Amino acid sequence: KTDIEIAQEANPQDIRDIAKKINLSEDDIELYGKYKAKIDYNVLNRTKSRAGKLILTTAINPTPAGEGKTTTSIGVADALAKLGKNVIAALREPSMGPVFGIKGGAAGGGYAQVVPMEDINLHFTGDMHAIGAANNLLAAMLDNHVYQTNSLNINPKRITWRRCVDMNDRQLRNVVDGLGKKVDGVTREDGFDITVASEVMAAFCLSNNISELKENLGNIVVAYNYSGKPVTARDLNAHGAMAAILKDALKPNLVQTLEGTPAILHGGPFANIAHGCNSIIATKMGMHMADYVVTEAGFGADLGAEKFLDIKCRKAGIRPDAVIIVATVRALKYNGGVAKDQLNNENLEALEKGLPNLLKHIENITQVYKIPAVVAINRFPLDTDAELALVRSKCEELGVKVALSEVWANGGEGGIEVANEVLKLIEEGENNFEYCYEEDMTIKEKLNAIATKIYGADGVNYTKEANKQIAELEELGFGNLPVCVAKTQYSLSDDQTKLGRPTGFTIEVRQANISAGAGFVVVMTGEIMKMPGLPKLPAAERIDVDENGKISGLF
Amino acid sequence: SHMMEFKTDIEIAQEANPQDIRDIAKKINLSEDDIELYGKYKAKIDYNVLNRTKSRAGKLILTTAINPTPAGEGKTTTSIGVADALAKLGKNVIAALREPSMGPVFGIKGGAAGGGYAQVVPMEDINLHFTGDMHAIGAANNLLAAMLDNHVYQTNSLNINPKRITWRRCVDMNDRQLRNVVDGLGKKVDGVTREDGFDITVASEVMAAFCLSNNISELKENLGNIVVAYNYSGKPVTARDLNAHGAMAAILKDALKPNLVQTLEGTPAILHGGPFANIAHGCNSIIATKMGMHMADYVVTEAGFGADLGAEKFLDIKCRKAGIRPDAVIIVATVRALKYNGGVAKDQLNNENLEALEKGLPNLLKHIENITQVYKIPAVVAINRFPLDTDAELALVRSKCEELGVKVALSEVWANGGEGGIEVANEVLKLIEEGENNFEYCYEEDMTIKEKLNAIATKIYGADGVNYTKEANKQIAELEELGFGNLPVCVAKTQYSLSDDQTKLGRPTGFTIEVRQANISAGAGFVVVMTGEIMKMPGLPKLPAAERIDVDENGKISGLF
Ligand SMILES: Nc1ncnc2c1ncn2[C@@H]1O[C@H](COP(=O)(O)OP(=O)(O)OP(=O)(O)O)[C@@H](O)[C@H]1O
Ligand SMILES: Nc1ncnc2c1ncn2[C@@H]1O[C@H](COP(=O)(O)OP(=O)(O)OP(=O)(O)O)[C@@H](O)[C@H]1O
Ligand SMILES: [K+]
Ligand SMILES: [K+]
């Protein structure tokens, strides 16, 4: 059975019945049909919390296919519901753009999904459109100020703010606008990002309430003046209207899994130029309404988990009680020199040389951040017991239990082995959580702390332009913020070919930007694509609608 | 006529007690299985209800007005007032109106759906994202542009000439910066360099085809007929050639369901669509008007601008493609507007001027002759009364209008609400039950483009002929050779006058309209004709209204209106 067939034959409950499972009245939610609803964030102010625990699901350095990190979160959440616990699965919302290029995807996979799958891949509750409308209003007010008076003395060559659209349109990567008559604006270079790559999205996810959201949108640096000083959205008096555009969008979206477990999908920025987690207000909503929250971070534990802990948790004042490290025997054998085609041969030798990658993420989670961790093995069909005994053998050496996950084929029943081990880590495991770095350090000291402790590098090298940018950010006062390293996800290093666990390498930083709205410094290692393109035969050509309004060709 | 205890539109809207939308749905025999809730005050009506219920064959009431003036007319408030009035009279009625775009909200100000005590609520949501119809229009518009540029970049096997790409992107913002752009810059993997531009989302042809589709099947067909470019041979390239109309209809699947809201008095109100009244027809969607006529006994809808533009496009475009016929027409006018057509300045409009009232009255009399003697529809003049309107002024309008065989009913819906439109509504009930309807189109399909433009300019506008530029004569002929000569025409001229001249007020006579360009909207199904330059993308003022909008610690928005 395909993922689209499992979702259709599933019987989803009325979302008002899902809300009763977390003690939410019908005056506390706003329906979007029978199967979707938004939760008023003011419930956080008139009801007391349940002080729920936080479960973070990460994974080893990924292969182009994946390791089932999202299916593991949904399956473990369903498993904890099978154990009688009150649980919410906090996940990200996909973007609509890639649906029309490489076709859509299920919120999860197999029997560990989130439903309705069709609305999630499309407009959902309109959160993407709200993000893009606030992004494009600030850009329209920025160009309007330069056209009317430019009393802020903005240099058009130094405008870093970019418009956005929820489409895979390579045509809009590099743009000249403001052409035509003198009443048609100020001519300058510009461009479009995909909406999820916008800084509005990152500040949307790193806001604890509506008051902090408006303050963060005001801190957004949109350009620089001719004197070199930053110009903020607050200087343009735009953050008040931007917060109004995002007023309803900031309300988390309540949905359900295939087994009726309450699910919350909210936000979803990049995991390279941003932190790649769901919104703070959705995570803290789950911890307010449930006893256990299963969330995740994009890419491997060297990026998403590092940014979940050093950026999201630092701004939310929260802390994970357990970490689930997802790993597959295919990915470890892929790290052991095996190609994608030969991933099915029982190669115990290549599994051992790809294991240091899994063991490195185990050391980062358990010894650097000091959080109890458990290795969840996403059992792909052809795994052998000798393969599963070797990965269980060397994970015992550093004091981490290994549970076998079968949530893709069995749903919640397949995650009981992982669920129980997480519940025991919350009871047993001591928690001495420490950040990878402190705020007082400079930008270069924070990057060196991440590169040596987490990545395993000897140090960080900076180009001539990066040194100029880092120093200018220090002079402007942005040296007290966290740093967001944008590098490849397929490797611990910045070289996407160095698989396994690289040894004597150094990170080369070539560009640094400021995301003062989200509250971190973006540090780029290579070139990052913020607007993907459409393939030769886009999937949109196969999408159709019948006489009753049923969509075909989406999945 | 005047509000005894004056309140702004916000104070009236927030002091109002709106019913649950499921209780509004019960007033039109719609169960909770037929509606998708968007909160407790907004809902979407499944369009497959018309395939499961017997139609009530409701009556259609079009609300129009004289030419727009700087003094105001009140065509939107009159629509809500008459609908609330019919509800007070025991009638099962629905008000069908347009949805505003979010763009002008951050420019100058946000406006109530109406005003005074003739409003539609929830006001805050309608002016903002509402149920997301505008976003789906823009998504489908920009998807077509993305696949158009992708095809040209990948193979260009359709032989599209990049200089001849008419399709533009859109955004629901007032951003003059995006009027004229050049994109596709950078490396070879960054597309094909060409000139481009952005329209405001309500100006997209997708929006025009969105309102002129009877069902989702016609929508997919209309979107496929959209002409996006021309090849080097001169032949049109359509969205169907790009295999895009199926995906565009999927983006517009939920959006095609009309939105169900309510007035201040609990009357069911359907808001769906809202394009321009110059480059398009300026009406709410056909499926919304069909929905009301299927579920109600009377439907009150409106058309943008004066009767020379919106009512003409309602009858010659929308009514033609929907197969419906208006039973009664409401011509809304104010005494101060007719005195403005008489030569009185905007600051002297409050003085009683009986002679200037008769000099500007030929404007109202011209629209009456168009509704009653050209389309042959029973009409009624609804005077939006103001406190300073003397009895001599009101008696002069009633005298001159009753010569054409049309009654004049006073309207006080702004200050009194539903009971301020009883006189107008009962005058409309008399026209439907008594007067005969020999509805005729202004022209027919078989005529050439220049014959349809001549029939409109002479019968409706009062012109002696139509003059064409050299550039217009070729474009008309190119559309004739390509087989677009059997489509209605949508004249894009000024709204402030019956001519193409903004300053000739009242009733100009010895003039001629001057066509300067002619485009094709094969998706909506009409040929666009222009007498001047059109602003498809407004700009922000020096101090935009967005600087005043704020949100508090609890999520309450202020400064919006
Ligand atoms: N044990 C399994 N057997 C077979 N297929 C699986 C298994 N686990 C996951 N998958 C498939 O892999 C796909 C992607 O999984 P998932 O998205 O959870 O991984 P991910 O790491 O979150 O992906 P990404 O990192 O690309 O976001 C799903 O569609 C699912 O069907
Ligand atoms: N009789 C009246 N007295 C005072 N104010 C009125 C009256 N009628 C209408 N208005 C005001 O005029 C404003 C606009 O009226 P309305 O929208 O009905 O006019 P319109 O020109 O037909 O529509 P639009 O203004 O949207 O183009 C409303 O805000 C309303 O408050
Ligand atoms: K989405
Ligand atoms: K709107």
Residue numbers in the entry:
A (entry chain A): 4 to 558
B (entry chain C): -2 to 558
What do the authors say?
FtfL is a key enzyme in C1 metabolism pathway. It catalyzes the synthesis of formyltetrahydrofolic acid from formic acid and tetrahydrofolic acid. Formyltetrahydrofolic acid is then converted through two reactions to 5,10-methylene tetrahydrofolic acid, a metabolite for biosynthesis of pyrimidines and amino acids.
To further investigate the structural mechanism of FtfL inhibition by BBR, we determined the crystal structures of PaFtfL apo enzyme, PaFtfL complexed with its substrate ATP, as well as PaFtfL complexed with BBR at 2.0 Å, 2.3 Å, and 2.6 Å resolutions, respectively. Structural comparison among our crystal structures of PaFtfL-BBR, PaFtfL-ATP, and MtFtfL-folate suggests that BBR overlaps with ATP and tetrahydrofolate on binding to FtfL, indicating that BBR likely competes with ATP and tetrahydrofolate to bind FtfL active site. Through structural analysis of PaFtfL-BBR complex, we revealed the interaction sites of FtfL, namely “active site” and “allosteric site. Comparison of the structures of enzyme–substrate complexes PaFtfL-ATP and MtFtfL-folic acid showed that the FtfL binding sites of both substrates significantly overlapped with the “active site” described above, suggesting that BBR may inhibit FtfL activity by competing with ATP and tetrahydrofolic acid for binding to this site. Each protomer comprises its own solvent-exposed active site close to the protomer interface. Structural comparison reveals that PaFtfL adopts essentially the same overall fold for each of the protomers and exhibits an identical active site as in reported crystal structures of FtfL from other bacterial species, indicative its conserved catalytic mechanism.
